[PDB]
Design a protein around this ligand. Structure first.
Ligand SMILES: CNc1cc(F)cc2c1[nH]c1ncc(-c3cnc(C4(C(=O)O)CC4)nc3)c(-n3ccc(C(F)(F)F)n3)c12
Ligand code: NA
Length: 189
């Protein structure tokens, strides 16, 4: 389970001391929005660095399926092994965040779930009406995992430029609330 991730984090997320693992936290979450853009359902992605060095990734895709009739969203946020025999998954990000809030806008409803170190505080639950669809993940990297909790504008921006070329017409906004800086990365092909 996620306990093993918390015990050997660099094995899952990358080096936790040289900046690799910390920024991989963002890139693992973002990859899901990129997949949603490649699928043709997402045209806007934003990545926000907050003053407390937490991160919000938000997209305007279909939203994670809820599939309650344990929610599908809880499965993808908490299960490490999908079964059987590259890319570690958002469950690793969850395990290594001291708190993470997932908000889904889908099928006229807003669903949310909160976790601490990957452990759900409560089940995914509906909390209101919405007119959009999409997914938002707000995570706070664990300072007990990363001795340096500070994000690098240059590192994120370099990777976002590479990502932008893969999806023409998909805007990726990088917003740094620590400094007031923001930049829209948008490739037109
Ligand atoms: C920050 N945004 C974000 C994070 C994350 F962490 C997962 C997703 C995400 N944005 C998404 N937007 C869409 C999907 C999605 C929706 N529907 C499918 C389905 C399809 O067949 O295309 C019906 C199964 N796959 C992916 C999604 N999800 C990424 C994984 C998953 C899922 F389905 F496994 F839960 N949803 C994510
Ligand atoms: Na949408």
């Amino acid at each position: 389970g996620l306990d093993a991730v918390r015990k050997r984090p660099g094995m899952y997320i990358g080096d936790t001391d040289d900046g690799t693992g910390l920024h991989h936290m963002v890139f693992e979450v973002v990859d899901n929005s990129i997949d949603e853009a490649l699928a043709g359902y997402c045209s806007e992605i934003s990545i926000t660095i907050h003053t407390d060095e937490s991160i919000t990734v938000r997209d305007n895709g279909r939203g994670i399926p809820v599939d309650i009739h344990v929610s599908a969203a809880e499965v993808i946020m908490t299960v490490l092994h999908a079964g059987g025999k590259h890319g570690v998954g958002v469950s690793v990000v969850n395990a290594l965040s001291h708190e993470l809030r997932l908000t889904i806008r889908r099928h006229n409803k807003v669903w949310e779930q909160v976790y601490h170190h990957g452990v759900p505080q409560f089940p995914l639950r509906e909390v209101g009406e919405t007119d959009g669809s999409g997914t938002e993940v707000h995570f706070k990297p664990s300072p007990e995992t990363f001795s340096n909790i500070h994000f690098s504008w240059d590192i994120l921006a370099k990777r976002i430029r590479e990502l932008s070329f893969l999806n023409s017409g998909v805007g990726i906004l990088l917003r740094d609330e620590r400094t007031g800086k923001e930049e829209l990365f948008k490739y037109e092909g």
